[PDB]
Amino acid sequence: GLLPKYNILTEDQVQKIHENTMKILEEIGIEFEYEPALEVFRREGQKVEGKRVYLTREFVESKLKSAPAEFTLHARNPENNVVIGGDNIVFMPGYGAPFIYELDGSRRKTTLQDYENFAKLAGASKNMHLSGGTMAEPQDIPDGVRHLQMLYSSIKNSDKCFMGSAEGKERAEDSVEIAAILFGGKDVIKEKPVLVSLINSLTPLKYDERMLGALMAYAEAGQAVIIASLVMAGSTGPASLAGTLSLQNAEVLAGISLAQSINPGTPVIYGSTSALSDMRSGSLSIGSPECALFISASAQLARFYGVPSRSGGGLNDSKTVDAQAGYESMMTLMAANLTGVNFVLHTAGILQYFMAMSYEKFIMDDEIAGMLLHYMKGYTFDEDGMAFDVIEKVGPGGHFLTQKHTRKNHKREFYTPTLSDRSAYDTWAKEKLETKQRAHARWQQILANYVPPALDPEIDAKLQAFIAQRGKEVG
Amino acid sequence: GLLPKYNILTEDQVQKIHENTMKILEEIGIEFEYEPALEVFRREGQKVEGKRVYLTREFVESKLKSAPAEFTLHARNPENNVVIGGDNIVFMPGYGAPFIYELDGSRRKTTLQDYENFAKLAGASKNMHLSGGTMAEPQDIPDGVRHLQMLYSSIKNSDKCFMGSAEGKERAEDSVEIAAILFGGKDVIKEKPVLVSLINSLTPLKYDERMLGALMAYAEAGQAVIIASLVMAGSTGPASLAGTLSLQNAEVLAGISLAQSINPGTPVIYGSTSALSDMRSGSLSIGSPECALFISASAQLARFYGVPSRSGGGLNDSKTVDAQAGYESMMTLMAANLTGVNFVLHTAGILQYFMAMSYEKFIMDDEIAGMLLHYMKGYTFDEDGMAFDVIEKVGPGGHFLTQKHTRKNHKREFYTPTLSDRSAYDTWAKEKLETKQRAHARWQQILANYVPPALDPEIDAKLQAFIAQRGKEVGE
């Protein structure tokens, strides 16, 4: 009923990586740019020189041992509750992009209306399990209330799970307060998690105050944190795959141990965003087989450490929804699915190494998403199934076009494409639409038809009341 | 170095397929429309009613044991010798397409010049290990001598391995003669196989005269055959994954068991071309995840039966080199690579479920092939390596780009793209070239600057005298 996961590493090699990781954390250490964070380490008997911290293997292997292998995140509509990790996998849009690249190859700043559109699309879509977070940076809006309008867009436009803000102590806490209003208290959400948020390290071997202030805010509440590291081999990490993975490993676990020492059993996702620093281009390259290699190894490491994994997505370096957007996104999304990544931020919409979102790419990515979930269902070994009797009725030289079996079973075992054009030349040649152009017609169809799920009047009567008060307070 | 193969099925599931396949062969049978193949199965003690042969698992499982797990195909230039069957993988162009799809959307008939062009492109590419066969149908040339002209154009334009004709006994025997001239004798090429050729069943549960005629000629000589079944689920096969796989499995093992009855130990490749008959279009769909599942499972069945596999390629249903060409072809080729297919016909050039080759698509596919081979290299766990001391040197907040170890190892471990554009928007926005356009400039550059490897004048002269005489025979 479900394909097994691909593990690309031998068990001796996983041992090498971990032995190298432990050595890094012990010998070289990690700088945490936050007093409260250092205090936690000191109060946990770890070595700490100014901002630097050296964790032993026992302290980390101990802190990991309390980190839960699986946790539900809770949706407003419980029909969309989501189990993290899992032979399970969840998909959701790209995150952080300040640009929209349009079908015409032009570029523009993102807006709240983009955030909102992407919320609706993720809402509308059978394959997007979460509506996501920071889908399109709302430069439309004044900075200190961007989070406020964003979590409200996510609530008013989706009944699926959304993400909390990682931009600071107070922002983090606002988000927790907002989930609280939405589920009826902070205690409810402490035991039934609601938010996930992306906490990043500052490669190589640091953590900035803003991320940390969000991380601890979340681990002191009940809420989920992705501890992602983005090591760019050649640049912010060593020019070797084993090297940059070892470095990524050291960073992610240091973040996990902090959360776990702050709050034992608090939900944490191992995050890998590592890729290549292209030496010809100077810059990040996530459409690379190196990226695909980090995605793949990271999924296996996360199993090894007993925790859920986030990595991959429709990842690529193209500026347009062309053949490159297609083959690079598939390579990285397929890696993520086959190797059993649990949580795929950036499943849909991303172009040019996280620099841009695209409406057409969103639809492209949703197709490949559906195709890969279909691959991962596998084969069905029941009577219908093995189909012996139909093969027999038909016999040598017959066809199956008109069998009852074909009519009943095609629908059951086969994927209906949402985007791919499967017609003959003469049919296609009348308009010669490429995937880009079809994708464009499709997103417009979907936003024209999406009715957002209703939000209890009094709930958003309290959502607004709070956005009002904080609106003043931050000014 | 290299990465382990992905096995998508459990031991039990593999056994269930095998059971369903034996039942199909024992109870339903396959038609072999070629008296000589029928007489082979007769002497083997197998039931024949008219043209229908029923094969027992005792017989099939016995014959499979004589098929080698690995063999070598031998090229003009022995550096291009190729192992079929290890953890090994070999790539080559598309096969059989009668159209070229152009950058501007138009289509036209394939000619001999197209054939030659693809032989050169294959010849020039570091990721194509064979030049292929039937790369473009030479509709240009009288039907009866086409195979003669393709074989020569293969031998002249590339010193890599190439494929024989599968179009009947006589054209197979011509292929064997040509191979024997090139390498010294029929004896030498029986000990050191040279040719590989595509023998398809006629799904469901048939094999026609022309394919059987070629199969038996090649088995009799030492030459490799791909025994390949293309089942279309919902059309020529049942509308189910396990069912279509079982039917394909029955077709292939019936074919391999015939080859091994003729010449025990003769080189065979288990071939899966199975895909979807799409419900809305009524046509073959190879860019489907069903196709990807057939490829993956077949890679693992071949391992089970102890023979090499062929399946997959840059397979897609698109009419143009667009995002669908990209994602469909990467899915099916990545499946092939990760599950450990040995021989990938149609790695490069195919559009629209085998109806077309495209020169831009060839370049695209050559890029995805390169990326995929880099993926399967995997990690390097030596000292340089785990990079601990360079990490120690640099330290928190540092950067690696100005280190000796970066200079040393950047090129060693990282893939350099031949097609993907990794620039920032502002560079790219100057011309806004999409992949298909960059591909278009590249194939023209490659072809323009390609120089075929010198062919021995004496052997060349013999090849031409053989082909001159045969063409006269075929015209009389």
Coordinates of C-alpha atoms in Angstrom, one line a residue, chain B residues 10-471:
Chain B
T10 CA 9.2 -6.7 -0.8
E11 CA 10.4 -10.3 -1.2
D12 CA 6.8 -11.4 -1.0
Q13 CA 5.6 -9.1 -3.6
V14 CA 8.4 -10.2 -6.0
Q15 CA 7.2 -13.8 -5.3
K16 CA 3.6 -12.9 -6.0
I17 CA 4.5 -11.4 -9.4
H18 CA 6.5 -14.5 -10.2
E19 CA 3.6 -16.8 -9.3
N20 CA 1.1 -14.8 -11.4
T21 CA 3.6 -14.8 -14.3
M22 CA 4.1 -18.6 -14.2
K23 CA 0.3 -19.1 -14.2
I24 CA 0.0 -16.8 -17.2
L25 CA 2.6 -18.9 -19.1
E26 CA 1.3 -22.3 -18.0
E27 CA -2.4 -21.6 -18.3
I28 CA -2.8 -18.9 -21.0
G29 CA 0.3 -19.2 -23.2
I30 CA 2.0 -17.0 -25.8
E31 CA 1.7 -17.2 -29.5
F32 CA 5.0 -17.5 -31.5
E33 CA 4.2 -16.8 -35.1
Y34 CA 7.4 -18.5 -36.4
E35 CA 7.6 -22.2 -37.0
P36 CA 11.3 -22.5 -36.0
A37 CA 10.6 -21.0 -32.6
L38 CA 7.7 -23.5 -32.2
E39 CA 10.0 -26.5 -33.1
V40 CA 12.5 -25.3 -30.4
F41 CA 9.8 -25.4 -27.7
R42 CA 8.6 -28.7 -29.0
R43 CA 12.1 -30.3 -28.6
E44 CA 12.1 -28.7 -25.1
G45 CA 9.0 -30.7 -24.2
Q46 CA 6.6 -27.7 -24.1
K47 CA 2.9 -27.8 -25.3
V48 CA 2.2 -26.2 -28.6
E49 CA -1.4 -25.8 -30.0
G50 CA -1.2 -24.2 -33.4
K51 CA 1.1 -21.2 -32.6
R52 CA 0.3 -21.1 -28.9
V53 CA 3.1 -22.3 -26.6
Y54 CA 2.5 -23.0 -22.9
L55 CA 5.6 -22.8 -20.8
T56 CA 6.1 -24.4 -17.4
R57 CA 8.0 -22.8 -14.5
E58 CA 10.2 -25.9 -14.4
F59 CA 11.3 -25.0 -18.0
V60 CA 11.4 -21.2 -17.6
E61 CA 13.3 -21.2 -14.3
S62 CA 15.8 -23.7 -15.7
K63 CA 16.5 -21.7 -18.8
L64 CA 16.9 -18.4 -16.9
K65 CA 19.8 -20.0 -14.9
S66 CA 22.0 -20.2 -18.0
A67 CA 21.5 -16.4 -18.8
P68 CA 24.6 -14.5 -17.6
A69 CA 24.2 -11.8 -14.9
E70 CA 26.8 -9.7 -16.6
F71 CA 28.4 -9.5 -20.0
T72 CA 30.6 -7.1 -22.1
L73 CA 29.8 -5.4 -25.3
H74 CA 32.8 -4.7 -27.4
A75 CA 33.4 -1.4 -29.3
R76 CA 35.8 -0.5 -32.3
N77 CA 37.8 1.4 -29.8
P78 CA 38.1 -1.0 -26.8
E79 CA 38.1 1.8 -24.3
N80 CA 34.5 2.1 -25.1
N81 CA 33.8 -1.5 -24.1
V82 CA 30.8 -1.7 -21.9
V83 CA 29.7 -4.0 -19.0
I84 CA 26.0 -4.8 -19.1
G85 CA 24.8 -5.9 -15.7
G86 CA 26.6 -4.8 -12.6
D87 CA 25.8 -1.9 -10.5
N88 CA 26.7 -0.6 -14.0
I89 CA 24.5 1.7 -16.1
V90 CA 24.8 2.5 -19.8
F91 CA 23.0 5.4 -21.6
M92 CA 22.2 5.8 -25.3
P93 CA 19.9 7.8 -27.6
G94 CA 16.3 7.3 -28.4
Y95 CA 15.2 4.5 -30.9
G96 CA 12.7 4.2 -33.7
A97 CA 11.2 7.7 -34.0
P98 CA 9.9 8.7 -37.5
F99 CA 9.5 12.4 -36.8
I100 CA 11.8 15.3 -35.7
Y101 CA 10.1 18.0 -33.6
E102 CA 11.7 21.3 -34.2
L103 CA 12.3 24.2 -31.7
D104 CA 9.5 26.2 -33.4
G105 CA 6.9 23.4 -32.8
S106 CA 7.0 22.0 -36.4
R107 CA 7.5 18.4 -37.3
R108 CA 9.0 16.6 -40.2
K109 CA 10.1 13.2 -41.3
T110 CA 13.4 11.7 -40.1
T111 CA 16.2 11.2 -42.7
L112 CA 19.6 9.4 -42.8
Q113 CA 21.2 12.8 -42.0
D114 CA 19.2 12.9 -38.7
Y115 CA 20.4 9.4 -38.0
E116 CA 24.0 10.4 -38.6
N117 CA 23.5 13.6 -36.5
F118 CA 22.4 11.6 -33.5
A119 CA 25.3 9.1 -34.0
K120 CA 27.6 12.1 -33.8
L121 CA 25.9 13.7 -30.8
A122 CA 26.1 10.4 -29.0
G123 CA 29.7 10.0 -30.1
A124 CA 30.6 13.4 -28.7
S125 CA 28.8 13.0 -25.3
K126 CA 30.7 11.8 -22.3
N127 CA 27.3 10.5 -20.9
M128 CA 26.4 8.3 -23.8
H129 CA 28.2 5.0 -23.6
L130 CA 26.6 3.6 -26.9
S131 CA 25.8 5.5 -30.1
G132 CA 22.6 3.5 -30.2
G133 CA 20.4 2.1 -32.9
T134 CA 17.6 3.3 -35.2
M135 CA 18.1 6.9 -33.8
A136 CA 16.0 8.5 -36.5
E137 CA 14.2 6.3 -39.1
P138 CA 16.0 7.0 -42.5
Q139 CA 12.8 7.5 -44.5
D140 CA 15.1 8.9 -47.0
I141 CA 16.4 5.4 -48.0
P142 CA 14.8 2.5 -49.8
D143 CA 13.2 0.3 -47.1
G144 CA 15.3 -2.8 -48.0
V145 CA 18.8 -1.2 -47.5
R146 CA 18.0 1.2 -44.5
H147 CA 19.6 -1.2 -42.0
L148 CA 22.8 -1.4 -44.1
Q149 CA 23.0 2.4 -44.2
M150 CA 22.3 2.9 -40.5
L151 CA 24.9 0.3 -39.4
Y152 CA 27.6 1.9 -41.6
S153 CA 26.7 5.4 -40.4
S154 CA 26.9 4.0 -36.8
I155 CA 30.3 2.5 -37.4
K156 CA 31.8 5.5 -39.2
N157 CA 30.5 8.3 -37.0
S158 CA 31.3 6.8 -33.5
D159 CA 33.8 4.3 -32.1
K160 CA 31.3 3.3 -29.4
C161 CA 29.0 0.2 -29.4
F162 CA 26.0 0.3 -31.7
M163 CA 22.9 -1.8 -32.3
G164 CA 21.9 -4.4 -34.8
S165 CA 18.7 -4.6 -36.9
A166 CA 15.7 -6.4 -35.3
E167 CA 13.8 -6.3 -38.6
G168 CA 13.8 -10.0 -39.5
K169 CA 16.2 -12.9 -39.8
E170 CA 17.9 -11.6 -43.0
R171 CA 18.5 -8.1 -41.7
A172 CA 19.8 -9.6 -38.4
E173 CA 22.2 -11.8 -40.3
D174 CA 23.4 -8.7 -42.3
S175 CA 24.1 -7.0 -38.9
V176 CA 26.1 -10.0 -37.8
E177 CA 28.1 -10.0 -41.1
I178 CA 28.8 -6.3 -40.7
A179 CA 29.9 -6.9 -37.0
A180 CA 32.1 -9.8 -38.0
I181 CA 33.9 -7.8 -40.7
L182 CA 34.5 -5.0 -38.3
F183 CA 36.0 -7.3 -35.7
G184 CA 37.7 -10.1 -37.7
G185 CA 35.1 -13.0 -37.7
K186 CA 31.8 -14.6 -36.6
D187 CA 33.9 -16.6 -34.2
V188 CA 35.6 -13.6 -32.5
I189 CA 32.2 -11.8 -32.0
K190 CA 30.6 -14.9 -30.5
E191 CA 33.3 -15.0 -27.8
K192 CA 33.3 -11.2 -27.4
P193 CA 29.8 -10.0 -28.1
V194 CA 29.5 -6.8 -30.3
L195 CA 25.9 -6.2 -31.2
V196 CA 22.9 -5.6 -29.0
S197 CA 19.4 -5.4 -30.5
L198 CA 15.8 -4.7 -29.5
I199 CA 13.4 -7.7 -29.7
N200 CA 9.9 -6.7 -28.7
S201 CA 7.0 -9.0 -28.0
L202 CA 3.6 -8.1 -29.6
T203 CA 1.5 -7.4 -26.5
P204 CA -0.6 -9.2 -25.3
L205 CA 1.0 -12.6 -25.4
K206 CA 2.3 -12.7 -28.9
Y207 CA 5.6 -12.6 -30.8
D208 CA 5.6 -11.9 -34.6
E209 CA 7.7 -13.5 -37.3
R210 CA 10.1 -10.6 -37.9
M211 CA 11.1 -10.2 -34.2
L212 CA 11.5 -14.0 -33.7
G213 CA 13.5 -14.3 -36.9
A214 CA 15.9 -11.7 -35.5
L215 CA 16.0 -13.1 -32.0
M216 CA 16.9 -16.6 -33.2
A217 CA 19.6 -15.3 -35.6
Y218 CA 21.2 -13.3 -32.8
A219 CA 21.0 -16.1 -30.2
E220 CA 22.6 -18.5 -32.7
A221 CA 25.5 -15.9 -33.1
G222 CA 26.8 -14.8 -29.8
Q223 CA 25.0 -11.4 -29.9
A224 CA 23.0 -9.7 -27.2
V225 CA 19.2 -9.3 -27.4
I226 CA 17.0 -7.0 -25.3
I227 CA 13.8 -9.0 -24.9
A228 CA 11.4 -6.2 -24.2
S229 CA 7.7 -6.0 -23.5
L230 CA 5.7 -2.7 -24.0
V231 CA 2.4 -3.3 -22.2
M232 CA 0.0 -0.4 -22.2
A233 CA -2.2 -0.7 -19.0
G234 CA -5.8 -0.3 -20.0
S235 CA -5.2 -1.1 -23.7
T236 CA -2.8 -4.0 -24.5
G237 CA -2.5 -4.8 -20.8
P238 CA -5.0 -4.9 -17.9
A239 CA -5.9 -1.6 -16.1
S240 CA -3.7 -2.5 -13.1
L241 CA -0.1 -2.1 -12.0
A242 CA 0.6 -5.7 -10.8
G243 CA -1.3 -7.1 -13.8
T244 CA 0.5 -5.2 -16.4
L245 CA 3.8 -6.0 -14.7
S246 CA 3.0 -9.7 -14.6
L247 CA 1.9 -9.7 -18.3
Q248 CA 5.2 -7.9 -19.3
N249 CA 7.1 -10.4 -17.1
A250 CA 5.5 -13.4 -18.9
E251 CA 6.3 -11.9 -22.3
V252 CA 10.0 -11.2 -21.4
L253 CA 10.7 -14.6 -19.7
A254 CA 9.1 -16.5 -22.6
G255 CA 11.4 -14.7 -24.9
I256 CA 14.6 -15.1 -22.8
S257 CA 13.8 -18.8 -22.4
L258 CA 13.7 -19.2 -26.2
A259 CA 17.1 -17.6 -26.6
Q260 CA 18.6 -19.7 -23.8
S261 CA 17.1 -22.9 -25.4
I262 CA 18.9 -22.0 -28.7
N263 CA 22.3 -21.0 -27.1
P264 CA 22.6 -21.5 -23.4
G265 CA 24.6 -18.6 -22.0
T266 CA 23.8 -16.2 -24.8
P267 CA 23.6 -12.6 -23.6
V268 CA 20.1 -11.3 -22.8
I269 CA 18.7 -8.2 -21.2
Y270 CA 15.3 -8.1 -19.4
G271 CA 13.4 -5.2 -21.1
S272 CA 10.5 -3.2 -19.7
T273 CA 8.9 -0.6 -21.8
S274 CA 5.5 -0.9 -20.1
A275 CA 3.4 2.3 -19.5
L276 CA -0.1 3.7 -19.2
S277 CA -2.8 3.9 -21.9
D278 CA -4.1 7.3 -20.8
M279 CA -7.9 7.3 -20.3
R280 CA -8.6 10.9 -21.6
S281 CA -6.2 10.7 -24.7
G282 CA -6.5 7.0 -25.5
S283 CA -2.8 6.9 -26.2
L284 CA 0.5 5.6 -24.7
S285 CA 1.7 7.7 -21.7
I286 CA 5.3 7.2 -20.7
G287 CA 5.8 10.3 -18.6
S288 CA 3.4 8.8 -16.1
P289 CA 4.2 7.7 -12.6
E290 CA 2.8 4.3 -13.6
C291 CA 5.7 4.1 -16.1
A292 CA 8.1 5.1 -13.3
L293 CA 6.7 2.2 -11.2
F294 CA 7.0 -0.3 -14.0
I295 CA 10.7 0.8 -14.5
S296 CA 11.5 0.5 -10.8
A297 CA 9.9 -2.9 -10.3
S298 CA 11.4 -4.3 -13.5
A299 CA 14.9 -3.3 -12.3
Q300 CA 14.3 -5.4 -9.2
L301 CA 12.7 -8.4 -11.1
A302 CA 15.8 -8.5 -13.4
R303 CA 18.0 -8.8 -10.3
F304 CA 15.7 -11.6 -9.0
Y305 CA 16.1 -13.5 -12.3
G306 CA 19.8 -12.8 -12.4
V307 CA 20.0 -10.9 -15.8
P308 CA 20.7 -7.4 -16.7
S309 CA 17.8 -4.9 -17.2
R310 CA 16.8 -2.3 -19.7
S311 CA 14.0 0.1 -19.0
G312 CA 13.3 3.9 -18.7
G313 CA 15.1 6.7 -20.3
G314 CA 14.2 10.4 -20.6
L315 CA 10.6 9.4 -21.1
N316 CA 7.8 12.0 -21.5
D317 CA 4.6 12.7 -23.4
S318 CA 5.4 16.4 -24.2
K319 CA 5.4 17.8 -27.8
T320 CA 8.0 20.4 -26.9
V321 CA 11.1 20.9 -24.7
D322 CA 9.2 22.6 -21.9
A323 CA 8.7 22.0 -18.2
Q324 CA 6.7 18.7 -18.8
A325 CA 9.6 17.4 -20.9
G326 CA 11.8 18.3 -17.9
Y327 CA 9.8 16.8 -15.1
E328 CA 8.5 13.7 -16.8
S329 CA 11.9 12.8 -18.2
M330 CA 13.8 13.4 -15.0
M331 CA 11.2 11.2 -13.1
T332 CA 11.6 8.2 -15.4
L333 CA 15.4 8.5 -15.8
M334 CA 15.9 9.1 -12.1
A335 CA 13.7 6.0 -11.4
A336 CA 15.9 4.0 -13.8
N337 CA 19.2 5.2 -12.2
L338 CA 18.2 4.8 -8.6
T339 CA 16.6 1.4 -9.0
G340 CA 19.7 0.1 -10.9
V341 CA 18.6 -0.4 -14.5
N342 CA 21.7 -1.5 -16.5
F343 CA 20.9 -0.4 -20.1
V344 CA 18.9 2.8 -20.8
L345 CA 17.7 2.9 -24.3
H346 CA 16.1 6.3 -25.0
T347 CA 18.1 8.1 -22.5
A348 CA 18.4 11.0 -24.9
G349 CA 16.2 12.8 -27.4
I350 CA 12.7 11.4 -27.1
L351 CA 9.5 13.4 -27.2
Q352 CA 5.8 12.4 -27.3
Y353 CA 5.9 8.8 -26.1
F354 CA 8.5 7.7 -28.7
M355 CA 6.9 9.4 -31.7
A356 CA 9.7 12.0 -32.0
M357 CA 13.3 12.9 -31.6
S358 CA 14.4 16.4 -30.8
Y359 CA 17.9 17.9 -30.9
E360 CA 17.1 20.2 -28.1
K361 CA 15.7 17.3 -26.1
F362 CA 18.9 15.4 -26.6
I363 CA 21.0 18.2 -25.0
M364 CA 18.4 18.4 -22.1
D365 CA 18.5 14.7 -21.5
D366 CA 22.3 14.7 -21.7
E367 CA 22.2 17.2 -18.8
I368 CA 19.8 15.2 -16.6
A369 CA 21.9 12.0 -17.3
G370 CA 25.0 13.9 -16.1
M371 CA 23.3 15.1 -12.9
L372 CA 21.9 11.6 -12.2
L373 CA 25.4 9.9 -12.6
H374 CA 26.8 12.5 -10.2
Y375 CA 24.0 11.7 -7.7
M376 CA 24.9 8.0 -7.8
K377 CA 28.6 8.6 -7.2
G378 CA 27.4 9.4 -3.7
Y379 CA 29.6 10.7 -0.9
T380 CA 33.4 10.5 -0.4
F381 CA 34.3 9.4 3.1
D382 CA 38.1 9.7 2.9
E383 CA 39.9 12.4 4.9
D384 CA 39.5 15.2 2.3
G385 CA 36.7 14.1 2.6
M386 CA 35.3 14.6 6.1
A387 CA 37.0 18.0 6.0
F388 CA 37.3 18.3 9.8
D389 CA 40.6 20.3 9.8
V390 CA 39.4 22.8 7.2
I391 CA 36.2 23.2 9.3
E392 CA 38.6 23.6 12.3
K393 CA 40.7 26.2 10.5
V394 CA 37.7 28.3 9.3
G395 CA 35.6 28.1 12.5
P396 CA 32.3 29.8 13.5
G397 CA 31.4 32.8 11.3
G398 CA 34.2 32.0 8.8
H399 CA 34.0 31.0 5.1
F400 CA 35.6 28.4 3.0
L401 CA 35.9 30.0 -0.4
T402 CA 39.5 31.1 0.1
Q403 CA 40.9 27.8 1.4
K404 CA 43.4 25.4 -0.3
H405 CA 40.9 22.5 0.3
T406 CA 38.3 24.5 -1.7
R407 CA 40.7 25.0 -4.6
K408 CA 41.7 21.3 -4.3
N409 CA 38.3 19.6 -3.9
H410 CA 35.7 21.9 -5.6
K411 CA 36.3 20.2 -9.0
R412 CA 36.7 16.8 -7.4
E413 CA 33.3 16.5 -5.8
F414 CA 30.9 19.0 -7.6
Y415 CA 29.0 18.6 -10.9
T416 CA 29.5 21.3 -13.5
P417 CA 26.2 21.8 -15.5
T418 CA 26.2 21.7 -19.3
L419 CA 22.7 23.3 -19.7
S420 CA 21.1 24.5 -16.4
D421 CA 21.4 28.3 -16.0
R422 CA 22.4 29.2 -12.5
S423 CA 22.7 33.0 -12.9
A424 CA 20.9 35.7 -11.0
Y425 CA 17.8 37.3 -12.6
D426 CA 19.6 40.4 -13.8
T427 CA 22.2 38.5 -15.9
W428 CA 19.5 36.2 -17.2
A429 CA 17.0 39.0 -18.0
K430 CA 19.3 40.4 -20.6
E431 CA 18.2 37.7 -23.0
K432 CA 15.7 35.6 -21.2
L433 CA 16.9 32.4 -22.8
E434 CA 14.9 29.4 -21.7
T435 CA 16.4 25.9 -21.5
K436 CA 15.1 24.9 -25.0
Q437 CA 16.9 27.9 -26.6
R438 CA 20.2 27.3 -24.9
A439 CA 19.8 23.6 -26.0
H440 CA 19.3 24.8 -29.6
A441 CA 22.6 26.6 -29.8
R442 CA 24.5 23.7 -28.1
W443 CA 23.5 20.8 -30.4
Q444 CA 24.6 23.0 -33.4
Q445 CA 27.9 23.8 -31.8
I446 CA 28.6 20.1 -31.0
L447 CA 27.6 18.8 -34.5
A448 CA 29.5 21.5 -36.3
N449 CA 32.8 20.8 -34.4
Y450 CA 32.5 17.0 -34.2
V451 CA 35.1 14.9 -36.0
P452 CA 34.3 11.2 -36.4
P453 CA 37.0 8.7 -35.1
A454 CA 39.2 7.4 -37.9
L455 CA 38.0 4.0 -39.2
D456 CA 40.5 1.5 -40.6
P457 CA 40.6 2.0 -44.4
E458 CA 40.8 -1.7 -45.0
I459 CA 37.9 -2.6 -42.8
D460 CA 36.0 0.4 -44.2
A461 CA 36.5 -0.9 -47.8
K462 CA 35.2 -4.4 -46.8
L463 CA 32.2 -2.9 -45.1
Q464 CA 31.3 -0.9 -48.4
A465 CA 31.9 -3.9 -50.6
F466 CA 29.5 -6.0 -48.4
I467 CA 26.9 -3.3 -48.5
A468 CA 27.3 -2.7 -52.2
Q469 CA 26.7 -6.4 -53.0
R470 CA 23.8 -6.8 -50.6
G471 CA 22.0 -3.7 -51.9

